[PDB]
Amino acid sequence: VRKLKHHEQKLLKKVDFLEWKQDQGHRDTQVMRTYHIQNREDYHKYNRICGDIRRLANKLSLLPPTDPFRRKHEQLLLDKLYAMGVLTTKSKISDLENKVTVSAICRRRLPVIMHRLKMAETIQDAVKFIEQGHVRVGPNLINDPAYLVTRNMEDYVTWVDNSKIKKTLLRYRNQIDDFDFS
């Protein structure tokens, strides 16, 4: 912590007060900084599900390469994860080990969907807006940031009517019709 001299750094090399090997390079912290994750245990709650997908993918690739059970369940899991939005392509089954990843499950969260739909300028702005209760999917208002938005369910991410944000974008283009409140 004091920038050890040469004899000290030679004499105690494995000493590190910040980065440990159980930390795994602080990647929970790293991807929760990237996608602005509030609570500490969401990374590991997603890591359990990525481990489920990859455990099944291992145990399913250990079946013989031609039997219809392996082919049906590999294709069925691939279709389910593409439809949910974690996987970005349902083509190859090496996605079920390589491209299945806590960052993919985190890119499917509601503020990241928002920021990619240009509905907020950054992920922290999207977090603030859906905490303030501006965003509804479908009819019903969504209030928490961790909400996972599937591919067919991202067509209905809008703002609530009577939103001040909806009002100011309509009045920026002065398409505001005050009959329907905005």
Residue 158 in contact with other proteins, rule: CB under 8 A:
no
Residue 127 in contact with other proteins, rule: CB under 8 A:
yes
Closest to other proteins by CB, 22 vs 140, is 22
Residue 36 in contact with other proteins, rule: CB under 8 A:
yes
Closest to other proteins by CB, 80 vs 164, is 164
At CA 91, angle to CA 90 and CA 96, rounded to 5?
65
For residue 104, the one-letter residue type is: A
Closest approach of other proteins to the CB of residue 48, in Å: 12
Quickly list DSSP for 68-132.
Answer: HHHHHHHHHHHHHHHHHTS-S--S-GGGGTSS--HHHHHHTBHHHHHHHTTSSSSHHHHHHHHHH
Q: 165 and 129 in contact (C-beta within 8 Å)?
A: yes
Contacts (CB under 8 A) with other proteins, residues 45-104: 59, 62-67
Closest approach of other proteins to the CB of residue 1, in Å: 8
Q: Nearest Cα to 136, choosing from 124, 116, 118, 154?
A: 154
Closest to other proteins by CB, 142 vs 153, is 142
Cα gap 81→68, rounded to integer Å: 20
One of 4, 25, 76, 152 touching other proteins (CB under 8 A): 25
Residue 15 in contact with other proteins, rule: CB under 8 A:
yes
Binding site for other proteins (CB under 8 A): 1, 12, 14-23, 25-26, 28-30, 32-33, 36-40, 59, 62-67, 118, 124, 127-128, 131-132
